[PDB]
Amino acid sequence: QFVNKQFNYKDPVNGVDIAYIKIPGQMQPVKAFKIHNKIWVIPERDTFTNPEEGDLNPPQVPVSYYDSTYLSTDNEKDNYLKGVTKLFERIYSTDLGRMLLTSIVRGIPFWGGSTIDTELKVIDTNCINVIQPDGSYRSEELNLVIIGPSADIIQFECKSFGHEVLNLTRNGYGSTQYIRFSPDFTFGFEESLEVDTNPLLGAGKFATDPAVTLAHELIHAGHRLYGIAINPNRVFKVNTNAYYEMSGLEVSFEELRTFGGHDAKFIDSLQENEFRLYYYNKFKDIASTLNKAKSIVGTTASLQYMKNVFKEKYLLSEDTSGKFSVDKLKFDKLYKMLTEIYTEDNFVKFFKVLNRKTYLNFDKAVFKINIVPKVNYTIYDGFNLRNTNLAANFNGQNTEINNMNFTKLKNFTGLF
Numbered sequence: 001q002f003v004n005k006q007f008n009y010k011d012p013v014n015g016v017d018i019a020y021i022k023i024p025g026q027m028q029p030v031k032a033f034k035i036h037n038k039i040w041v042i043p044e045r046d047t048f049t050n051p052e053e054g055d056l057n058p059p060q061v062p063v064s065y066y067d068s069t070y071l072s073t074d075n076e077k078d079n080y081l082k083g084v085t086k087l088f089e090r091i092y093s094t095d096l097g098r099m100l101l102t103s104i105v106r107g108i109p110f111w112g113g114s115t116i117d118t119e120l121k122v123i124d125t126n127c128i129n130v131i132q133p134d135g136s137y138r139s140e141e142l143n144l145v146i147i148g149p150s151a152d153i154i155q156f157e158c159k160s161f162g163h164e165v166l167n168l169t170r171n172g173y174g175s176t177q178y179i180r181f182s183p184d185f186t187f188g189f190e191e192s193l194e195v196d197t198n199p200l201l202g203a204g205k206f207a208t209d210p211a212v213t214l215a216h217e218l219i220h221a222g223h224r225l226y227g228i229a230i231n232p233n234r235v236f237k238v239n240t241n242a243y244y245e246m247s248g249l250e251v252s253f254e255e256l257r258t259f260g261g262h263d264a265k266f267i268d269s270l271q272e273n274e275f276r277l278y279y280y281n282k283f284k285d286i287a288s289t290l291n292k293a294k295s296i297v298g299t300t301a302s303l304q305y306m307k308n309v310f311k312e313k314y315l316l317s318e319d320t321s322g323k324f325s326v327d328k329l330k331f332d333k334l335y336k337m338l339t340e341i342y343t344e345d346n347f348v349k350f351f352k353v354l355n356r357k358t359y360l361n362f363d364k365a366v367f368k369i370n371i372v373p374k375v376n377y378t379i380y381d382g383f384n385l386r387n388t389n390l391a392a393n394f395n396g397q398n399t400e401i402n403n404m405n406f407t408k409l410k411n412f413t414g415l416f
């Protein structure tokens, strides 16, 4: 199992894996759960990571959904925690998911906080502050936090804190990733491509498996933890869908990469090679920075332990004297793993689900779901339960046939 404890929300705090924490304005502490080394879950709406997003009311775009009361009660938080746990187990049960989660846990954000070259130092915004049994705070490094959505319930995304001059998600360093996510809602899509990619057609017959949606965000998180995310200012000015063109819709290269399959091929070979070279250069910077460091700051870890952590993360070569370098062959291999093997399209193949065929579509609807009961959804089958009417033809994802598992909250078709 990926998650050794089946936490209940009302389990007592212990200051270790069930604790009140603060994240790096003023905030009150929030109850959080450490589901795995380097990975925490905060069953709260995210009113914390962005100062401009401190409340839960609408400011509405077609694809949005608002309910300021979602995820306010203990029962909802208990189910949130169980649902997120189940999705991590579903992911981890696949070879591809085990690979991705292993990469994520090994992807410790770089200790790039020193302004003195000869010293190696943590960056504080890659930590959380945990209330200990005596009521005082300690600082804990972590890689990933799953948190509830902000005002728009269905705006899922990977958020992280910046640095004053460093671009941590694009300079190889990485940073702690906060994924706004809910297991309590999902998207409807259409099985015919010419309907799915038309904004005027379809009610959302099939439901997206939320394990795919979480995997998608985890793939972004992998890019961002390794500091290889593509700048969102690099976009495909889509010219393969007449409706996209009418509205001038642009899609980031980072999204196309993450989806994979034919979408990723809209990044041409020259651009692919440019980015590979750019990020290779960032890993070389990191090796040079590590070589300059002769002392560590803080008392919790030795310099040789931290140099090993980063050797293992970046797959660096180390000579006998202890000098690091980047092997271009190993770089290309890791870069390829993170960017081409870990894709939405590949997850679809492992989960054996129906899914959108492209990111360049129009979402059809949003449904309320409940994946916690095993009669509804399982680690091994998702909605498409074996030895039932739901096992065949993705019938479990068919919102018409498995109608008790989906309640439509909003239609998007006709609003674009």
Ligand SMILES: [Zn+2]
Pocket: 216, 220, 255, 258
């Ligand atoms: Zn995405």
